[PDB]
Design a protein around this ligand. Sequence first.
Ligand SMILES: CCCC1=C(CCC(C)C)/C(=C/C(C)=C\C=C\C(C)=C\C(=O)O)CCC1
Lengths: 210, 10
Amino acid sequence: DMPVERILEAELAVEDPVTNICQAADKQLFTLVEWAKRIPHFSELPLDDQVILLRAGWNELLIASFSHRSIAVKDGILLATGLHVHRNSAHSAGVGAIFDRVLTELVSKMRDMQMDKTELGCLRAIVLFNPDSKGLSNPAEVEALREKVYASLEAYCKHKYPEQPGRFAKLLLRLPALRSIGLKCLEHLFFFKLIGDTPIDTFLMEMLEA
Amino acid sequence: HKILHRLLQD
Ligand SMILES: CCCC1=C(CCC(C)C)/C(=C/C(C)=C\C=C\C(C)=C\C(=O)O)CCC1
């Protein structure tokens, strides 16, 4: 009903440093739409609810994506544009705190547990199927899809890593940190928009709309 | 939300 194979397929189908980061974010919103279209039963929801889910979860989804991407590197983040932001660059641009939070609470833990792409895709699908999203035409259907995602995820974990009985819960317990970090990053984005001395592209700007 | 709607419909 919610096979982890299709979720993994969705992940593999989509393959001032603050300015570069904003460029990469705008580039990856377009890609996020396609990714979400490849998640089972997402396209079958009402279009308004698809809009609501993506607008509620885009920042967390993209943060998870590049945090997992940056496993291969140390003290840095790999942007989807093929550009590397070093910890020192971020600190010298005045955004060292949130960057260190990303490296410490997300990237290094993903690397410590060797979180694979299937698990990343399942966590992102859980984030996508956020039943607390305000305005959902039917939050019960979204809740059910979320339950199916984490059922399949727990099954995959107990089959692939039978020696780690706590791996499922450890995967789920990174979601609070992802939520906090996403909120903080959104705050930074709104400050950049208000200040208006940082170029924000059209899709990112639309995500900043009311 | 023009852009998101257009991308979701196609
Ligand atoms: C620097 C000030 C904070 C800030 C960040 C944090 C970036 C930092 C690495 C913690 C943003 C992150 C978000 C919500 C999305 C980014 C998507 C990308 C970059 C995708 C990709 O490359 O695949 C938006 C701009 C402002």
